[PDB]
């Protein structure tokens, strides 16, 4: 869509909405793009706001090479132009930054000495503008995560700034705080000689004091007048803005000066006490770009706006809650909706393996680790992941497995381990047990009935981190079992109906991703025994209505199922047979 252009796309989810399909497209055999779908198609649109991403190896203009630091040198990240001096090259300002930030202290306190280096929190990096690159076209300094300003003509006067002024009761300004997203200087003004230098390239040194928030710049060994004071906990990304006037523009020198730590010490926690400069592979050059997509939300907040009256003004009213699951990238200080991982493959794979590690660390009754994990993944997140229909299949399976392992796996395993033993107390309810519910020889529904055999006791502990008692560590963390049961029944009821249509829109992208996690959770709950009476009746009707009629919708047993789903159905049938055997044993004991 061009400038001032409005258009609509109809995917034909409802065929009646289409206006010319019957005139041209119904007879020819063409199908609407959304014919076999149950939910609206997610639509992706071009992102307006530029973001920093790693420079691609196939970029036609920018090239980045990693120069290892020798004994007499320091590690350097060099930025060069691939297509300088040729036709159709691009000659605009290009924004660069390093991938990892320096975080200032939470509270600002009111040859080289090794002790001073061990106790200091000052970090330094330098940028060498190569002789021949015009220096007034190059800016060096720090930026924050909020920087998204892509202006063809950049200058230090157009940076976004604000001054929060806090005053007392009568009006005395007891403090003023300047806030910005760009703390940079220009090499052109930084030069003392100025103009063209050819003794060597200009060395602009940036010094950050993480304990005081003072930003100081050194140019060719002398202190520049420009300085910046930042707020506590500010994350500063080393950044260089440059317009290319040379095949070689600049380089990121990651060395150190007297009495200062290298940038790697501030960046990485493992190297916090290492004065030797380093450039680990995690650190890399990123640039501002517009080539990114944005995922339009499937559902928006319902907001009602109207004028009540002339005197009362305009009423804005929102009442229905809406939530989304946000994935936070720690190093970039950036958060995205987790539903955007359907197109971010590396993040999706890493997060799926993170969920697998979460399951592994708490596997086999590690209740302390389960309580610890309840902090990172809480029950609203788990319920949202379970119920969401737009979740990627891998994340859906991982979150189902995590929910099973943290809260349910221990009791499920215990009650499975105590399954092939029948310790039946001899009480009146035991004596009341009979093989058949009434005078005719008709089998009752499996599981339904009175069971008196001794069974393990189900107990859970509330996961609170303000308490200091260690008795909570035994027993698995508590989860709302009634809510989980109702949600599982509702989702299985939806899935059985949606399977019969054989749509092109399964939850998770495949029939396996739709059914295997849900049926696994259902089987776990069934083993745990949470289901009772009416829930068992409904879920047996879901499995097979005709056989389990109360005393022809295709149940789960006949839906042309995949093999992974068939295996879990076999497991469910095995459990039903075990329940029948237990009932028989109890009736024999009652007769005895």
């Amino acid at each position: 869509l061009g400038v001032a252009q409005v258009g609509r796309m109809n995917f034909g989810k409802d065929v009646s909405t289409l206006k010319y399909f019957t005139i041209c497209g119904l007879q020819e055999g063409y199908e609407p793009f959304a014919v076999n779908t149950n939910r609206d198609i997610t639509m992706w649109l071009s992102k307006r706001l530029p973001q920093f991403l790693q420079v691609p190896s196939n970029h036609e203009h920018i090239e980045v090479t990693r120069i290892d630091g020798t004994i007499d040198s320091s590690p350097c990240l060099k930025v060069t132009q691939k297509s300088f001096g040729s036709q159709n090259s691009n000659t605009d300002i290009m924004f660069y930054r390093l991938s990892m930030p320096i975080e200032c202290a939470e509270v600002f306190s009111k040859r080289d000495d090794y002790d001073f280096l061990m106790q200091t929190s000052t970090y330094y990096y330098s940028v060498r503008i190569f002789p021949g690159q015009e220096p007034a076209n190059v800016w060096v300094g720090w930026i924050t995560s909020d920087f998204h300003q892509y202006d063809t003509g950049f200058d230090l006067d157009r940076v976004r700034t604000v001054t929060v002024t806090l005053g007392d009761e009568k009006g005395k300004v007891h403090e003023s705080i300047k806030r910005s997203n760009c703390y940079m200087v220009c090499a052109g003004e930084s030069m003392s000689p100025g103009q063209g230098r050819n003794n060597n390239g200009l060395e602009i040194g940036c010094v950050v004091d993480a304990a005081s928030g003072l930003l100081t710049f050194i140019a060719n060994g002398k202190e520049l007048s420009t300085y910046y004071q930042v707020e506590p906990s500010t994350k500063l990304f080393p950044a260089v803005f440059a317009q290319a006037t040379s095949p070689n523009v600049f380089q990121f020198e990651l060395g150190r000066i007297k009495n200062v730590m290298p940038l790697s010490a501030g960046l990485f926690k493992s190297e916090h006490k290492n004065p030797v400069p380093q450039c680990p592979p995690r650190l890399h050059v990123q640039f501002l770009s517009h080539v990114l997509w944005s995922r339009m939300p499937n559902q928006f907040l319902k907001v009602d706006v109207s004028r009540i009256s002339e005197r009362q003004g305009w009423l804005v009213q929102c009442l229905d809650p809406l939530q989304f699951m946000s994935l936070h990238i720690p190093e970039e200080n950036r958060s995205v909706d987790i539903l955007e991982l359907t197109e971010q493959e590396e993040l999706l794979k890493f997060h799926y393996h993170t969920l697998r590690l979460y399951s592994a660390v708490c596997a086999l009754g590690n209740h302390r680790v389960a309580h610890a994990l309840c902090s990172h993944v809480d029950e609203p997140q788990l319920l949202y992941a379970i119920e969401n229909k737009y979740m990627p299949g891998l994340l859906r399976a991982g979150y189902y497995d995590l929910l099973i392992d943290i809260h349910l796996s221990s009791y499920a395993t215990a009650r499975l381990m105590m399954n092939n033993e029948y310790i039946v107390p001899m009480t009146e309810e035991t004596k009341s047990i009979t093989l058949f519910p009434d005078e005719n020889k008709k089998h009752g529904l499996p599981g339904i009935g009175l069971s008196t055999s001794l069974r393990p006791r189900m107990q859970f502990s509330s996961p609170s981190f303000v308490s200091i008692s260690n008795e909570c560590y035994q027993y698995s963390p508590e989860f709302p079992l009634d809510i989980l049961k109702s949600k599982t029944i509702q989702m299985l009821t939806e899935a059985v109906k949606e399977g019969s249509l054989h749509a092109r829109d399964p939850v998770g992208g495949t029939t396996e991703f739709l059914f295997v996690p849900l049926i696994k959770l259902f089987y776990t709950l069934l083993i745990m025994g949470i289901f009772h009476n009416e829930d068992l009746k409904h879920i047996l009707q879901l499995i097979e209505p005709s056989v389990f009629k109360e005393a022809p919708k295709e149940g789960l047993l006949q839906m042309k199922l995949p093999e992974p789903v068939k295996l879990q159905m076999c497991l469910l049938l095995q459990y039903l047979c075990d329940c029948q055997v237990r009932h028989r044993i109890e009736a024999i004991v009652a007769f005895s």
Binding site: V164, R282, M325, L327
Partner: protein, 434 residues
């Protein structure tokens, strides 16, 4: 070469070693999956017999010796300085081939993976090196999946080194797989390894991606676009009020969002700049919006506590009066007629400003824009003009979404492209010179 003999006199068979390494990798290549079951099982038998014969002849220690004697040189340039330049060309390739050969020798063979436990400690000591990280990690993964004895010797230092590999090299799912293999082996859980991995990885919240359930936040604004520029017939001093009719502090597990103030546009586009057009971001979450929530002043996603008489979060029957001064950049607030002891000052005035409110579910607020668009509860401060005076003559004031998409039917949704700059907002009469 280590004892510094003449390079030419030393016979270094680089090409033959490389070709023999390729042949050995081909020889120990595992069977393919598409093969029939009987043929695949026969090939597996042959591979296991080859591995057993090699381990009995002690060819694993020879590979370890070659790897150790090649790691004495830090880099390919160092190896090309000590030995020949052609040798330095394929130093990296020889190291990779040797690591792959070791992985092939030990893969799937429990006896070999158990006998590799003694050398396992020597292996992890070079995991940080970039030239051998992948090969060492693969060998570690094979040893961990096959031999339960290696999990008995993996210690806190080894686990911390494996974890620090994630910090130094970045997000690599193979390190996560190795950590998973360290926890459970053949259905047996390792409580010490589980505890160490949890306590050394989880609390930082700096490597693994973090998840949180966030409320949606929407924004509503009037039609007015007011700005300041040289020689423009536009009043620089404006005022408006907001009334909170109802607010639920917790409609969900997360606190309700309610912020009011002013926002600015990037350039002369009517388009709110610096923020996302959907998400959990509201007024004050970027350097283009300036918000007040009752207790804090919001700008650039940073909150500062501001003092006020009986200060409290915005509740029912709370009137917030917002004052904007463009002559001297200033934004001030007054709650319930009492002055809020805080100010936004010296901000960018290049764009156009407009009133804005950000909220989540559970909000009932009313814009009091003055005149016939809501009656002010309190006197505007001297000089400040009601916001309804900024409406263009023909245009009609209405409160609309700050962004251009709402909740509606997908086929009825209007997709909007870029639109023209709103230069007509500032009327600068520019006559020709005479």
């Amino acid at each position: 070469l280590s004892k510094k003999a003449k390079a030419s006199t030393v016979d270094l068979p680089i090409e033959s070693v490389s070709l023999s390494l390729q042949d050995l990798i081909g020889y120990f290549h595992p069977p393919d999956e598409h093969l029939e079951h009987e043929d695949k099982q026969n090939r597996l038998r042959a591979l296991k017999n080859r591995q057993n014969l090699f381990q009995e002849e002690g060819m694993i220690n020879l590979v370890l010796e070659c790897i150790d004697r090649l790691h004495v040189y830090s880099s390919a340039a160092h190896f090309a300085d000590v030995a020949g330049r052609e040798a330095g060309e394929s130093w990296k390739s020889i190291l990779n081939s040797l690591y792959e050969l070791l992985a092939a020798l030990i893969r799937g063979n429990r006896k070999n993976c158990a006998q590799f436990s003694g050398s396992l400690d020597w292996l992890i000591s070079r995991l940080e090196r970039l030239e051998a990280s992948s090969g060492i990690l693969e060998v570690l993964h094979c040893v961990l999946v096959e031999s339960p004895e290696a999990l008995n010797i993996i210690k806190e230092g080894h686990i911390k080194s494996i974890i620090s590999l994630l910090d130094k090299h970045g997000r690599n799912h193979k390190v996560l797989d190795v950590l998973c293999s360290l926890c459970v082996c053949h259905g047996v859980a390792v409580r010490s390894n589980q505890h160490l991995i949890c306590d050394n990885l989880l609390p930082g919240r700096d490597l693994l991606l973090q998840t949180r359930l966030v409320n949606h936040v929407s924004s509503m604004r009037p039609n007015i676009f007011l700005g300041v520029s040289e020689g423009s017939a536009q009043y620089k001093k404006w005022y408006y009020e907001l009334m909170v009719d109802h607010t639920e502090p917790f409609v969900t597990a997360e606190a309700t969002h309610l912020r009011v103030g002013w926002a600015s546009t990037e350039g002369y586009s009517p388009y709110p700049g610096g923020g996302e057009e959907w998400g959990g971001n509201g007024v004050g979450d970027d350097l283009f919006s300036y918000g007040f929530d009752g207790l804090h002043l919001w700008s650039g996603c940073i909150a500062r506590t501001v003092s006020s008489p009986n200060q409290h979060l915005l509740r029912t029957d709370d009137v917030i009066s917002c004052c904007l001064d463009l002559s001297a950049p200033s934004i001030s607030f007054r709650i319930n007629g009492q002055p809020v002891q805080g100010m936004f000052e010296n901000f960018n005035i290049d764009g156009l400003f407009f009133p804005v409110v950000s909220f989540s579910a559970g909000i009932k607020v009313r814009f009091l824009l003055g005149g016939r668009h809501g009656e002010f509860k309190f006197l505007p401060p001297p000089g400040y003009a009601p916001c309804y005076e900024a409406v263009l003559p023909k245009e009609k004031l209405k409160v609309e979404h700050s962004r251009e998409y709402k909740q509606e039917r997908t086929y009825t949704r209007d997709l909007l492209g870029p639109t023209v700059s709103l230069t007509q907002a500032a009327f600068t009469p520019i006559p020709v010179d005479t």
